[PDB]
């Protein structure tokens, strides 16, 4: 899920150029918004 | 209602666990489908 | 031409365009799904019919606006769905 | 009892709304929309009636139910 | 019997004040009574909300005036405020 | 009466009693009901003026709901004020779209 | 000045629901606005019913039917059940 | 169980809701179970919302609920 | 995050407020709330405009779609 | 100092960003002015009420609660800034 519409026409060209490097990095994980993996703790 | 929302949300934890297994499954599937030898053999679409 | 004659005739009159007994039967059929042995004052049915026709006429006006926007004379179910979505009903 | 809203009646309502040509599915679509509207309004009215501990639905219940939706109606005792 | 109140006689007096040779049907008198009650309810609800915002126990003419300003459109609100101020001053000047 | 003292025709006592029994405020000042009665009288006078004009336009000497609907929907400020209300037996304004007219 | 807010109660409810989750200050502002708004809606509708029926008291029936009017089907059913359960147990205790 | 919330098994304040219903100009009189019923409904609704907000914050790998998750 | 710049919006709000009463002061949270409401309103309006434009089998939004949306919403 | 014609502070890229968040892919050039007028009419309607509240409280500063009540009157209830 994402708040923003992605430019799939650019993304799919990058993935077509090197499908191996795409999966090496993490593959489809970049679509999960931002992987901060940290407590926001916005409340003071 | 609280015990049903707990039950429904535990079914939703199973939904999330399945989704996590699916992402891990596809990562490995892609890693198997594409080898470093195919990347070396880049059929550059030089304009024909 | 008869269509425009009817439009002129029906924007002039104010009389209810639905027959009374069918609307009463529909109201009782619907009401019977919430509580059995309910009674309705005739004025309640009259008010319901007035409100329902006013609502439907306003909806048909919005539908006509949408149809003309698309450059059509013919109103279509997609026009109704679009009007109800833009109003905020669906 | 939803068949009682005949095709000529929907045609008449569209002509008073200024509609010049009508598709064939408009009738079923309109029946569905009217059913939804009436369902909501009658549900509110019956809620009012049950609260008033009555078995008859008055005109006041309908008027308050329309005021609840925002469809204020004049001329029925409001 | 059931001695229930309405605005019919006042609406009729106002009509004969503005239009002498014009009558009114009973259904229109009902609609005008409903209209008066509606506008009363709107104005009183706005006045109550304003009083509760400003932490006051009293509904005075200031609340009524500002509710009129909030509710009615420009020229209509202006004329209505003019009328209300005129009437209040004429009533207060005498006793 | 208090209507006479203010030169009004609407009741001041009735409006004060309705404000008192309507659970609006702990106490009600004496200048609120006079002002509110004046506003209501002005608005009903405007409504009845336009409705009488509309009824004469139709050559009738009695006001029916149709003339009220025409007066309301024909006046911009009133139609903005009464934007959500439906009038039983009021009908609709005659309005035919430009593109539907024959050629 | 001691300003009143439902923040501590929302913390209590959250820990009851999600012990390992926290709320930001702005989300607490939103929750306070929501609670105040719902209270205003329900009290206004209860008053409207009481005046409609020439009554001068707000009893749990008015609140129940207000919940019936405001909430949709499942929400109304569950909230009515919860409220009746709580009122029954408060009466019993 | 001194507080009326305890006697009803609630977390919201029965006494404050009672005071606001009285010092709020809604009706001449107030019942004894109307504040209890309303507090129960409010607590239930807040729990309902916080469950889904926690779910959404956990789907974004976040410990703190923010307006985005609401 | 808000899309309209904060200071131009402040100046616009002050300019509009300059008609109803001269030399008014504003809280910062007032301007923030105004910007949030304005952007939410405009996003909803652009949603309705996109719906109308798609209805017309298009992809480009045009001023008549805005006008139709505001007409159906009941806006003056 | 008087403010004069600050409507052009709603830049074209800002309107484009608002459209993209709204899902609009291609935008006509007359939109930007259309939108600007619409926004003006909106703010003038909200501010006139907020100011009406501010003036009735016999205050000289427009507070957040005035805006909240003005929005609430139009059915524009806003959570986050009080309420």
From Swiss-Prot, chain G:
Species assigned in the record: Homo sapiens (Human)
Residues joined by cross-link Glycyl lysine isopeptide (Lys-Gly) (interchain with G-Cter in ubiquitin): 3, 89
Modified residues (N6-(beta-hydroxybutyryl)lysine): 3, 54, 85, 89
Modified residues (N6,N6,N6-trimethyllysine): 54
Modified residues (Omega-N-methylarginine): 55, 61
PTM-bearing positions, type Dimethylated arginine: 48
Modified residues (N6-crotonyllysine): 3
Modified residues (Phosphothreonine): 84
Taxonomic path: Eukaryota, Metazoa, Chordata, Craniata, Vertebrata
PTM-bearing positions, type N6-acetyllysine: 54
Entry function: Core component of nucleosome. Nucleosomes wrap and compact DNA into chromatin, limiting DNA accessibility to the cellular machineries which require DNA as a template. Histones thereby play a central role in transcription regulation, DNA repair, DNA replication and chromosomal stability. DNA accessibility is regulated via a complex set of post-translational modifications of histones, also called histone code, and nucleosome remodeling.
Family: Belongs to the histone H2B family.
Modification sites for N6,N6-dimethyllysine: 26
Assembly information from the UniProt record: The nucleosome is a histone octamer containing two molecules each of H2A, H2B, H3 and H4 assembled in one H3-H4 heterotetramer and two H2A-H2B heterodimers. The octamer wraps approximately 147 bp of DNA. Heterodimer H2BC11 and H2AZ1 interacts with VPS72 (via N-terminal domain).
Modification sites for N6-malonyllysine: 85
N6-glutaryllysine carried by residues: 3, 12, 15, 77, 85, 89
Name this protein carries in UniProt: Histone H2B type 1-J
UniProt keyword terms in alphabetical order: Acetylation, ADP-ribosylation, Antibiotic, Antimicrobial, Chromosome, DNA-binding, Glycoprotein, Hydroxylation, Isopeptide bond, Methylation, Nucleosome core, Nucleus, Phosphoprotein, Ubl conjugation
N6-succinyllysine found at: 3, 85, 89
Major site of localization recorded for this protein: nucleus
This protein's encoding gene: H2BC11
Modified residues (PolyADP-ribosyl glutamic acid): 4
Residues with PTM N6-methylated lysine: 85
Glycosylated residues in this chain: 81
Keyword check for Secreted: no
Swiss-Prot record, chain H:
Keyword ATP-binding: no
GO cellular component: CENP-A containing nucleosome; extracellular exosome; nucleosome; nucleus
Subcellular location: Nucleus; Chromosome
UniProt GO molecular function: DNA binding; protein heterodimerization activity; structural constituent of chromatin
Gene Ontology biological-process entries: chromatin organization; heterochromatin formation; negative regulation of cell population proliferation; protein localization to CENP-A containing chromatin
Cross-link Glycyl lysine isopeptide (Lys-Gly) (interchain with G-Cter in ubiquitin) residue location(s): 2
N6-crotonyllysine PTM sites in chain numbering: 23
Residue numbers of N6-(2-hydroxyisobutyryl)lysine PTMs: 23, 61-62
Free-text description of this protein's post-translational modifications in UniProt: It is involved in the initiation of both imprinted and random X inactivation. Ubiquitinated H2A is enriched in inactive X chromosome chromatin. Ubiquitination of H2A functions downstream of methylation of 'Lys-27' of histone H3 (H3K27me). H2AK119Ub by RNF2/RING2 can also be induced by ultraviolet and may be involved in DNA repair. It is present at 35S ribosomal DNA locus and impairs binding of the FACT complex.
Keywords annotated in UniProt: Acetylation, Chromosome, Citrullination, DNA-binding, Hydroxylation, Isopeptide bond, Methylation, Nucleosome core, Nucleus, Phosphoprotein, Ubl conjugation
N6-(beta-hydroxybutyryl)lysine found at: 23
Oligomeric and partner information: The nucleosome is a histone octamer containing two molecules each of H2A, H2B, H3 and H4 assembled in one H3-H4 heterotetramer and two H2A-H2B heterodimers. The octamer wraps approximately 147 bp of DNA.
Similarity field: Belongs to the histone H2A family.
Name assigned to this protein: Histone H2A type 1-B/E
UniProt lineage: Eukaryota, Metazoa, Chordata, Craniata, Vertebrata
Primary gene name: H2AC4
Residue span relative to the full protein: 15 to 84 of 130
UniProtKB/Swiss-Prot annotation, chain I:
Residues bearing the modification N6-succinyllysine: 21, 64
Modified sites of kind N6-lactoyllysine: 21
Residues carrying N6-acetyllysine: 21, 57, 64
PTM annotation (N6,N6-dimethyllysine): residues: 21
UniProt keyword terms in alphabetical order: Acetylation, ADP-ribosylation, Chromosome, Citrullination, Disease variant, DNA-binding, Hydroxylation, Intellectual disability, Lipoprotein, Methylation, Nucleosome core, Nucleus, Phosphoprotein, Ubl conjugation
One Gene Ontology term, aspect cellular component: protein-containing complex
Modified residues (Phosphothreonine): 22, 49
Top-rank taxon: Eukaryota
Residues that bear N6-(beta-hydroxybutyryl)lysine: 21, 64
Family: Belongs to the histone H3 family.
Linked pathology: Glioma: Gliomas are benign or malignant central nervous system neoplasms derived from glial cells. They comprise astrocytomas and glioblastoma multiforme that are derived from astrocytes, oligodendrogliomas derived from oligodendrocytes and ependymomas derived from ependymocytes.
Protein name from the UniProt record: Histone H3.3
Organism annotation: Homo sapiens (Human)
Residue numbers of the full-length protein present here: 60 to 135 of 136
Swiss-Prot record, chain J:
Positions bearing N6,N6,N6-trimethyllysine: 1
Keyword Ubl conjugation (UniProt): yes
GO biological process: chromatin organization; negative regulation of megakaryocyte differentiation; nucleosome assembly; protein localization to CENP-A containing chromatin; telomere organization
Record-listed cross-link Glycyl lysine isopeptide (Lys-Gly) (interchain with G-Cter in ubiquitin), residues: 72
Modification Phosphothreonine occurs at: 61
Residues found modified as N6,N6-dimethyllysine: 1
GO molecular function, one term: RNA binding
N6-propionyllysine found at: 12, 25, 58, 60, 72
PTM sites of type N6-lactoyllysine: 12, 58, 72
Main location: nucleus
GO cellular component terms listed in the entry, alphabetical order: CENP-A containing nucleosome; chromosome, telomeric region; extracellular exosome; extracellular region; membrane; nucleoplasm; nucleosome; nucleus
Subcellular location: Nucleus; Chromosome
Signal peptide limits: none
Residues found modified as Phosphotyrosine: 32, 69
Modified residues annotated as N6-glutaryllysine in this record: 12, 40, 58, 60, 72
Residues found modified as N6-(2-hydroxyisobutyryl)lysine: 12, 25, 40, 58, 60, 72
Result after altering residue 75 to R: Found in a patient with a neurodevelopmental disorder; uncertain significance
Role description: Core component of nucleosome. Nucleosomes wrap and compact DNA into chromatin, limiting DNA accessibility to the cellular machineries which require DNA as a template. Histones thereby play a central role in transcription regulation, DNA repair, DNA replication and chromosomal stability. DNA accessibility is regulated via a complex set of post-translational modifications of histones, also called histone code, and nucleosome remodeling.
Family: Belongs to the histone H4 family.
Protein name per its UniProtKB record: Histone H4
Gene encoding the protein: H4C1
Full-length numbering of the shown residues: 21 to 103 of 103
């Amino acid at each position: 899920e994402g708040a923003v519409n992605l430019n799939w026409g650019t993304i799919m060209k990058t993935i077509q150029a090197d499908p191996y490097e795409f999966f090496e990095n993490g593959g489809w994980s970049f679509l999960g918004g931002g992987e901060s993996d940290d407590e926001e703790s916005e409340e003071e | 209602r609280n015990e049903t929302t707990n039950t429904e949300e535990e079914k939703e934890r199973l939904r999330k666990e399945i989704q996590k297994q699916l992402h891990e499954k596809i990562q490995k599937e892609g890693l198997a489908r594409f080898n470093k030898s195919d990347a070396q053999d880049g059929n550059e679409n030089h304009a024909v | 031409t008869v269509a425009l004659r009817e439009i002129r005739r029906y924007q002039k009159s104010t009389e209810l365009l639905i027959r009374k007994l069918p609307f009463q039967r529909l109201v009782r059929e619907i009401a019977q799904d919430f509580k059995t042995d309910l009674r309705f004052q005739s004025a309640a049915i009259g008010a319901l019919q007035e409100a329902s026709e006013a609502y439907l006429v306003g909806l048909f006006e919005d539908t006509n606006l949408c149809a003309i926007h698309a450059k059509r004379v013919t109103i279509m179910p997609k026009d109704i769905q679009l009007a109800r979505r833009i109003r905020g009903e669906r | 009892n939803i068949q009682g809203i005949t095709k000529p009646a929907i045609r008449r309502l569209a002509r008073r709304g200024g509609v010049k040509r009508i598709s064939g599915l408009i009738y079923e679509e309109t029946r569905g929309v009217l059913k939804v509207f009436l369902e909501n309004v009658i549900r509110d009215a019956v809620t009012y009636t049950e609260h008033a501990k009555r078995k008859t639905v008055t005109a006041m219940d309908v008027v308050y139910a329309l005021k609840r939706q925002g469809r204020t109606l004049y001329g029925f005792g409001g | 019997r059931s001695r229930k109140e309405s605005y019919s006689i006042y609406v009729y007096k106002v009509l004969k004040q503005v239009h002498p040779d014009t009558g009114i049907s009973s259904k229109a008198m009902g609609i005008m009574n409903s209209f008066v009650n509606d506008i009363f309810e709107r104005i009183a609800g706005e006045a109550s909300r304003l009083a509760h915002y400003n932490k006051r126990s009293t509904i005075t003419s200031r609340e009524i005036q500002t509710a009129v300003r909030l509710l009615l459109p420009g020229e209509l609100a202006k004329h209505a405020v003019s009328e209300g101020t005129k009437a209040v001053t004429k009533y207060t000047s005498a006793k | 009466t208090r209507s006479s003292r203010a030169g009004l025709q609407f009741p001041v006592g009735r409006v004060h009693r309705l404000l008192r029994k309507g659970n609006y405020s702990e106490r009600v000042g004496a200048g609120a009901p006079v002002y509110l009665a004046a506003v209501l009288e002005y608005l009903t006078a405007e409504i009845l003026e336009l409705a009488g004009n509309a009824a004469r336009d139709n050559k009738k000497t009695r006001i029916i709901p149709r003339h009220l609907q025409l007066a309301i929907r024909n006046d911009e400020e009133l139609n903005k004020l009464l934007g959500r209300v439906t009038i039983a037996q009021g009908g609709v304004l005659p309005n035919i779209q430009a593109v539907l007219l024959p050629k």
